[PDB]
Design a protein around this ligand. Structure first.
Ligand SMILES: CC(C)=CCC/C(C)=C/CNCCN[C@H]1[C@@H]2C[C@H]3C[C@@H](C2)C[C@@H]1C3
Ligand SMILES: CC(C)=CCC/C(C)=C/CNCCN[C@H]1[C@@H]2C[C@H]3C[C@@H](C2)C[C@@H]1C3
Ligand SMILES: CC(C)=CCC/C(C)=C/CNCCN[C@H]1[C@@H]2C[C@H]3C[C@@H](C2)C[C@@H]1C3
Lengths: 330, 325, 328, 332, 332, 329
């Protein structure tokens, strides 16, 4: 099916750190997840295309889950790079309708529940940490639940995976925050903001001030507070990963999470996060293909952070509290 | 038996990218494969030895499979750097006759059919691509089959692995071609020409012309073409590895393949051949092996110049692997 | 989540940097038991390791150390070691130990006793004969292996046969100790104690502290090579032990230490930097599965084998042992 | 079909000599099959030599002592045997051929157990079993060693934990229990055969000739000796259980359990039974289970134990002892 | 080891037909815990059955039985039953009881107390309504089920769920208990003992003893089937319970009784022999035993059809008898 | 929970003498999948067997049977067999079929399509050569073996290799089908049906029905023993197939049927009762619940037949060879 070939071609084109593990999924989960990642990509391609007015965008987002069942629909007024998926959307919609109704259900549902949240923030900004969790819930949190629901529907993972929408939520919230925190600069030099105001407001006047050499010290302090915030999702991330019983599925969830921790440990109290690029011993003897190994890798990156925590740092007291919990817990 | 310790000694003196993983095999596969490797080595030592009259080497290759049953057979005229296995073959043949009879047949059969192939390609060079597969079969194909027939004989692996020889063959062809494709200069200073005639000739006059700088643009276009050919085997390699269920046997098969793909991804569209998530997971499980493969497929897919004549094929094939499922 | 429990894991990450990680990875009930088993042994060794104390008072403490686990107010403030926090704030450690299931309390309590005894036995004397070198390592490692081995079977995560194999659980420990000692020859010398079997170096130099003298580097290396060859004989038992484990978290905890050990002996063999300071397929597989561990081990056996000066008084010995491992 | 036809012959003799073992032996996994098959055949041919009384002692001894050596004598045979299982001796070259085809590590165990077993069998060619210590010594040579051999094999094939073969005393118990149970039931048969196996220091305190129990008038004293010996055997049960509880391979468990289970089943029927001296003896929650798992085996054993306890005559001079051991097995 | 402990297993085998073997086969601590729990329930039951004891003396004994467990010197010498041995030497069983882990004692004592109060309220009354028949079986069997379950969980050889779902555990007991009552109709009827729910057999005859009368065989059978159909409603829970078990020794302990109970029901269904002595306990069941859930379900369903193929239309329960069976079929 | 599904299991127990109890023991989805996969074959079989339906009317039904699974209102009232209840109430069966997961439907439907073409092929021709006897058994039993194997792999309960290897899956079916054909000789004879390969019985008699005549009993046994020897060759694959299984419930479902088959062949070997009616059937200490047991049981029966092999029997040699092969390797 050349139509299916095209999809995977776009997947590797719009997903450099997932296509590999996705195409490694067993049976049904493979095509399902592949498509699920293509629709969300197209949806994200819209919310970001600024060339589109809010009055014209909201509708496109609210009625995105509908374009799926409309064999002809396709957006051409996209100036983004991923526009390719929107223009040739019919191909994606074609495969989508080729999936079992079970998967069509979960996906379409997410695209709908997500198309609402995304549009909801097209006018406002993330203020409180609570509003930050809420945002991460629509753009990524749901993505976590959607998959968890596909793993249970595929019958490769016990029903509990898709039931505990909490962990599925924390899982996606951990990666999204790690991204938001890491991509601060580019997002700023991109004209967008994702950091919680009620947090950076206690350090500087505008969120963009962290892009100024004179506010580098304050930038790090705020950075550490947001990193300490994401560390709380770990307890759940660990618990979720320990419930998986399918290798292919584990490799799909484990790897991303492990790289999130590695990144947080590489960014913690690091000024490079505001200057340029930030690159990531018993951890050399293990790999993220089994639970006992992930934990060991995680616990290590934890001490790596716990060892660089400044006593002066305003959020140091908290940073240790959480790390101390992850150690003892279980 | 000291005679057994001697074999494992040559195994190390002869191997490197295997000796360790072979000794890791479980149960009787350990000895079977160890001996199976030594006999094939000695056979290959007689094939490469140039200080042997063609009208003296042919019989040796055609009858090497029989010397396994002769307690005192041996070769002394050899000058190769691995003549130790030939001079002290009785030691190897002895341990061969101690292996379960079910293994003797497999090893003897391959060694017999492989000796014939090598004798055939002594006065010839690879001409057509169809002939290239034939050569790789007599040197790497049969090897993949022999092992498959050994793993299923020991019951450590499903009987399917030893039956589908069409797949076990690809395992060998994929590794063989990989080596050949890269070892261009190596075999060029030795005097051998493994690259298929109908391929390089479609670019130059003599196969050694690629070594000349003013042909670097024709050499890289021929290189890429061959690499493309080898990439067609990957689909089978995945199918093959997907059937393995024994860990020790998996490490024995997977590791080589993964290492071979890594090579093609480093030689593709690279002139030096004439002069991300892979760091978070190893090849211990199938899902990982696939993931690793897919990544190397993109590394190559993200370096395919539209100017290269193979641009079409290379992509078409890579698209089939990523779509497979 | 008891604060005292957190205090323990905090001392674990302090007194350790290459074990704390895998220990916290242990499944369920083993996590705590083992973590604690490690701390109580830290204090027990901290005493013997402290010199401010006299053999006059040491013997008593060591012999009764195991009993202090049931005395909520016991603690030692008369120690100046980098590991004081475990002896001074011991009540917090023994407290959690008191909450460990009976099964675990029994095992640990036993090791501490048996260990303390023989540990006090070498407070003055040295390690003369090789057969004595195994006796010492048995008290400071062997039992440790038997302890962990008995804790795995107790938790039921490992087959009960794992606990019975006390002999291989011992060899499993002596392989780490011998390696640890052999490697830290310099520090131990620049500290005050001597562990190298007297009967071994005696026929090399009159004083074990001579191997630190440049004009003896030759005799030094030769002696080293002999000891390393002595330690390699434990490999067969090691491989057999790991070949029995069935739990992943347990395997990771037993395999890693063993791999790092061999990775050290292979780096210290015939190496002269041992008396001056510190020190392909491998990069393809992790020590997370038995077959991989084998490949790793065997691969190191070769890096040692192909570098055995045939002019060494142990070359013959070293070769046959690194041969029984291949054919094994 | 295009493989060893001599191995096919070996299994033919296996079914010819061992009617109630071949089935479970052929059920063994991997290398163990041939190893245990060839091992059982060499010991059967070695047993045939000892049993054949038409062979002088000065002639039989040299054969027993060097029997383990003939395993490497491709053309060695024996055509002067008059026993029924003489076939394995006349066509022995075929058996030794396959013996040399086994891993050289399996040959070591078999060859060794075969050697030491010959030494013992020779010792008891010019003497009889007097004391119990002597009785356990004989059974050791003819059974205790087979238990050790088989155990050393299981461990060698890595199918069973290295502890199985290492513990030679528990393996010895496995062999003694079966051998004794066998002798106790084979009394009448060995009496007409001219071979006495019962320990003198036991039946002597009852009669003057071991053949007296055959004479009906002494059936009462017979059942008394019969009960003392069974009580003697029951002391091997504690180890039989300890040994089985260590097995992890299913095929092996079946191979070791089934026999032991029938052994106890036999002693249970023979206990206080007079027919043991008149004719052959013969066979309820056990009907619900099968000897395939450890706990099931125990249940079967414990149930066969209680079927002997409420049978113990208060009179019999073994009362206290019989009940005593059955009270130890019954309380872990 | 302990002289007192061995005495317990000593009594266990003489007070337990075929149940001590399965118990003695249990793993770890469960072995001793169950042995004691079985004896304490034995004595308690021995007192309830002993008719020589006046209701005035029996009532206090039942209510205070659980407390005797902690009284080192309590014993009963007025018992006249045959299993009175546990009552006269109770101090021993009492001694070992205190040796068990505090957690196990709680269960035994609790089930012992609650069971005493129950047996005490039926001392003068007869089972009337079906609801009462359930009320009774709970006191003499249901609680036994709840008890054991809480013992397996405490030992951690099973999951907490087992000891938490008291309904499934109760059904396990009621099924076996009701089955015994349905079968031993005549036996107990020959002892003045009345168990059959009066509210049920009253729609057929005037007094339960009439089913023993030949001319009422037709009525007796219809009533028989009505009760059996009732017991069948417990199968769903029985299956659910057995499926949650993870320990082999524990499975064999629970599975065997249930299976053997279904076999009894299938054999009694529409059988006229139930009123003329004992009944004959009569496919794919032969090729397999009860040691794995799948086999058990197979054997169970097997007996389900047994009863199904024998359901006559003329029977008043015919319609609802197959209703429950058809339900047990679909429920995966 | 499901008035219809509850009816399916009602029919299962009806048409399934001794198979339902084991099928209802399967885990997860396999349970219903196999129950339905069985009922559909029960119907397709009831048609092929119905002799009151002309061939020209039967061929179309067998060829399109696989399509009726998607025709809700389809049924068959003309059936006169005794297992027609599934045909007259087929809509109730096809309903639950369409409810099965898609992965299961694909398999079940595919088998019917494949089996239909075959059954129609032998509607007017009698089995001739042994090579055709296998082909026929392939359509009636072989396909069922490959069918179930695909369901086990689809349900994820069995390794993907179980459903891949169709050669041994076929043997698992042929071994059972041949045992039935061999045993039910007199039952099929007294019904106007012949399954015994003509190329075979023709070397003993002039009419396959002559074996019913007492004066040919000796020649009948010789043919009987030959066919049995022919079926023994399938054992090697049966043991191989069983040794690949891992799920307990599946093992019981596959092992039990095979065991009873061997026991049946052992009771029928060189047994004259086969031509005069029906023949009834360590082995007590161990049951078919594990591979090792099954083997020992199989071997016990093998020796049972082997010990009764007449030296004069024109198949005695072959009878021994196969036994030795199963025995040794
Ligand atoms: C499997 C469990 C429990 C959680 C998944 C955790 C997880 C990958 C969240 C996605 N957060 C990254 C930002 N997501 C974006 C990328 C991926 C999808 C397609 C594109 C690009 C638009 C968004 C959705
Ligand atoms: C498997 C474990 C733990 C012990 C072995 C238990 C076990 C079979 C003892 C044999 N005791 C019966 C008498 N043995 C004889 C028979 C079998 C062999 C060949 C022939 C006939 C001569 C003897 C040796
Ligand atoms: C499990 C593996 C590998 C094979 C299954 C072996 C197996 C049941 C073959 C079918 N051969 C018996 C004749 N089958 C018929 C009966 C049962 C089904 C419904 C009715 C009556 C029509 C046919 C199908």
């Amino acid at each position: 099916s050349s139509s299916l070939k095209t999809c995977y071609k776009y997947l590797n084109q719009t997903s450099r750190s997932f296509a590999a593990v996705i195409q490694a999924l067993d049976g049904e989960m493979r095509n399902a997840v592949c498509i699920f990642y293509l629709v969300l990509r197209a949806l994200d391609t819209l919310e970001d295309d600024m060339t589109i007015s809010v009055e014209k965008k909201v509708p496109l987002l609210h009625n995105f889950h509908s374009f799926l069942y409309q064999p002809d629909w396709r957006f051409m007024e996209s100036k983004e790079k991923d526009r390719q998926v929107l223009e040739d959307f019919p191909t994606i919609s074609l495969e989508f309708r080729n999936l079992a109704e079970k998967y069509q259900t979960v996906i379409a549902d997410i695209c709908r529940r997500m198309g609402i949240g995304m549009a909801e923030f097209l006018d406002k900004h993330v203020t409180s940490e609570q509003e930050w969790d809420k945002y991460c819930h629509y753009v990524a949190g749901l993505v976590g639940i959607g998959l968890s629901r596909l793993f249970s529907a595929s019958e490769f993972e016990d029903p509990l995976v898709g039931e505990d929408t909490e962990r599925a939520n924390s899982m996606g919230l951990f990666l999204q925050k790690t991204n938001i925190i890491r991509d601060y600069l580019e997002d700023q030099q991109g004209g967008r903001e994702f950091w919680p105001q009620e947090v950076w407001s206690r350090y500087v006047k505008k969120l963009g001030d962290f892009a100024l050499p004179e506010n580098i010290d304050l930038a790090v302090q705020c950075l550490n507070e947001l990193i300490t915030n994401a560390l709380h999702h770990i307890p759940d991330v660990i618990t979720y990963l320990s419930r998986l019983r399918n290798q292919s599925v584990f490799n799909f969830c484990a790897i991303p999470q492990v790289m999130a921790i590695a990144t947080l440990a590489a960014c913690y109290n690091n000024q490079q996060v505001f200057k340029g690029a930030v690159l990531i011993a018993v951890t050399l003897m293990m790999d993220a293909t089994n639970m006992p190994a992930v934990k060991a890798i995680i616990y290590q990156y934890m001490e790596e952070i716990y060892h660089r925590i400044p006593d002066s740092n305003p959020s140091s007291s908290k940073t240790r509290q959480i790390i101390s919990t992850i150690r003892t817990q279980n």
